[PDB]
Structures are given as C-alpha cells and as structure tokens.
C-alpha cells in the first residue's frame, strides 16, 4: 500500500445497482406468481 | 369522527411548533418548510381512498 492507496476511496456502486435490480425483479415475479396461482 | 381527531393532533403540533420556531430564532424560509413537513406527516394522504 502507501502512496498508491487509491482503492481506499473507490466503491463499485455499478455492480451493486445491477444486483439490487436483479433481486427486485425476482421478488416482483414471485409476487405475480403467487397472485395468479389458483386462477389456472 | 376520525377526521376530527386527526385534525386535532395536526393543529396541536403545527401552531405549537410554529410558535416554537420563532421562539428559537428560526427565519421565515425555514419555518415554512417545517410547517409543511408537519402537515404532511400528520395527514394520512392515502386512507380515504
């Protein structure tokens, strides 16, 4: 480390947003499944 | 009956903190923001529907 410790000030918000969206999508689908499960 | 109760706690909190804001030296553009936040906080904007 030392002088080139630039990583100590970086965060991968991109990957975090991607995962959080995948998860939101999954939860939304599961929801729909439960809602329509019975009407078919 | 409940719009009466809800409004009771809304005015009680509002008129009181507005007088408090100026008893502590708050300027006008800050107190207006307060008043708004308190009114929205107390009113259940989605109930009746």
């Amino acid at each position: 480390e030392g002088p080139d410790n630039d990583e100590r000030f970086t965060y991968d918000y991109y990957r975090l947003r991607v995962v959080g969206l995948i998860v939101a999508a999954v939860l939304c689908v599961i929801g729909i499944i439960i809602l329509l499960a019975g009407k078919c | 009956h409940f719009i009466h109760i809800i409004t009771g706690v809304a005015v009680f909190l509002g008129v009181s903190f507005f007088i408090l804001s100026l008893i502590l030296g708050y300027s006008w553009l800050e107190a207006v923001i307060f008043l708004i936040g308190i009114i929205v906080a107390n009113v259940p904007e989605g109930l009746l529907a």
Binding site: G2, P3, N5, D6, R8, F9, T10, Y11 | -
Partner: protein
C-alpha cells in the same frame, strides 16, 4: 357533555377515568417507554464497539477534495467600498479568524511541532494509523510565508486600498496523498513553467472570455514562492493521531482590479486524484465575485 366529560362528582372521574386508571396507564407507559429507551441504548452501544477511533470506515463521499477560502461570502461575492470602513469588516473578521491559528506562539518547542524543509519537498510517513507511537508530529507553517496578506503588517490585508487577498485552502482528508500532473506533452498551458513536482498548483482565471481584460495581475504567495501546496504537509493522520496539525495555505492578491464592476474569478487546482463536479462548485475549484466599488 362539555362539563360532565370534564368532571363529574358521583363516580369521582376526571376526563373519563378515576385516579387508579390514570395511575395504571401512566405506570404502564413509564415501564414500556423505559424498556424502549434501554433497548435503543444497548443497540447503540454495540455500535460504538463496531467502529474504530483512528479511521473512518467509509471514505468515498470525500474522495475528490474541495477548495475553500478565507473570506466568508454569502453568495460567493466580495463587494465593499474603499471609503466606508464598516463595509469590509465582516470579511476581515473572518480572514483574521483563519490566520489567528497559525500564530508562532502556538507553534513552539519540539513537541509536537517539527521544522521542515523551507522549500517544497516530498511526502513524509510517520508510520501507520496506530497508537503504538505516541502523538505524531506535524510540520510548522509560518504566517510570514504569506508576504503581503498576513495581517502582521496591514491588518486589513488589502481591502483598505482596492487590493484584496484571498487565502485558499485544500480540504483535509485522512490518508490522502496529493498527486500532481507529470511533465509529459499533455499538461495545461499555465502549468508548464515552474514544474516543481513537489507542489500542487493552484491557478485562478476569469469565468468568461470577456472578463480576462478586466482582471489585472493575479499575484500568488505560498511556500517557497510557488503557487501551490507543498507535498510535505501530507498525508493527514486525523485529529486523534495528530492534534495541533496545520494545513498549508495559499494567498492570492487580485492587484489591478477594475473599479465599479462585477468580476467572476474561478480558481482551480490541478492533479491526478483531483476531479471536478458540475453539481458541486467547490470540488477542486471555487468561484468568487469580486466588486471593489469606490
């Protein structure tokens, strides 16, 4: 109704209940709220145990350092009359508040101050961010270094005859190493002359192309006579590990300023781990609206 629901004398009720009801409800709420308070306090104590005293866990919201100044402008405007003295008082009181911390009387002895190179130098690492070695040592920064803006000669600092000063300062960040631009063919125009690697350059200019002509001679004062910050004052170890620490400063005199006209002056620092933001107008650069109306 009105009177009864307030006080009846047969059931000995007040507002609706008797003395034993108000007492049971009050006792219940006191015990309930007491438990609530104790639980919140316990969950906050475990939080005090989860953090370190020598370093902030997250340092991403403060990665690109800011660029502040000594005068306190309400709307980033410096307007004052050269005749009426009660016009630049709010400014001087601030300038003075800032420089009043670099007094030599404060900086004395071996502890905790250390004499450093009178000429810009490289970084200095006083170890890690631990308590093993005692209170680290910070370099001394003398007032006099700033030549015409020090309040030691002309207390007012310039504002008295149409020649105000502006003390710029880099925002203190823990473990932040300033990195200047290298000598390669790509570098701004301005920066070519006087490339002291060890100095972070600061250079002011005019926001609009027109205003160029109306702005006169920007005279910068600093460590070694350069218009920048010496790398030897870095990195910063934090308050806990370096109390009594002084950050470099750079004075800027706006000599030959046109009278009775609003001038927009944008100052900017250059460097690798320095990046500006179109939303935050204080990240790396800063704007000032000077108007010496007399």
């Amino acid at each position: 109704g009105w009177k009864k629901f307030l006080w009846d004398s047969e059931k000995k009720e007040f507002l609706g209940r008797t003395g034993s009801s108000w007492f049971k409800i009050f006792l219940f709420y006191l015990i309930f709220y007491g438990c609530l308070a104790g639980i919140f306090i316990g969950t906050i104590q475990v939080l005090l145990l989860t953090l370190s005293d020598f370093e902030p866990k997250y340092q991403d919201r403060v990665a690109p350092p800011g660029l502040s100044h000594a005068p306190y402008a309400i709307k980033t405007e410096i307007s004052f009359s050269i005749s009426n003295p009660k016009s630049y008082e709010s400014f001087v009181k601030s300038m003075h508040k800032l420089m009043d911390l670099y007094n030599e009387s404060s900086q004395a002895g071996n502890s905790p101050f250390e004499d450093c190179s009178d000429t810009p130098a490289d970084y200095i690492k006083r170890g890690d961010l631990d308590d093993s070695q005692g209170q680290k040592k910070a370099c001394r920064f003398s007032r006099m270094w700033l030549k015409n803006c020090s309040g030691l000669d002309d207390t007012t600092y310039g504002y008295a005859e149409g020649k105000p000063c502006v003390v710029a300062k880099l925002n203190r960040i823990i473990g932040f190493y300033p990195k200047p631009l290298k000598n390669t063919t790509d570098l701004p125009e301005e920066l070519q002359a006087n490339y002291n690697q060890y100095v972070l350059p600061l250079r002011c200019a005019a926001k609009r192309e027109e205003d160029r002509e109306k702005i006169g001679s920007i005279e910068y004062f600093g460590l070694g006579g350069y218009a920048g910050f010496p790398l030897q004052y870095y990195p910063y170890y934090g308050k806990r590990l370096q109390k009594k620490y002084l950050q470099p400063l750079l004075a800027i005199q706006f000599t030959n300023l046109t009278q009775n006209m609003e001038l927009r002056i944008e100052c900017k620092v250059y460097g690798e781990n320095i990046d500006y933001s179109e939303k935050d107008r204080f990240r790396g650069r800063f704007e000032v609206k000077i108007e010496v109306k007399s």
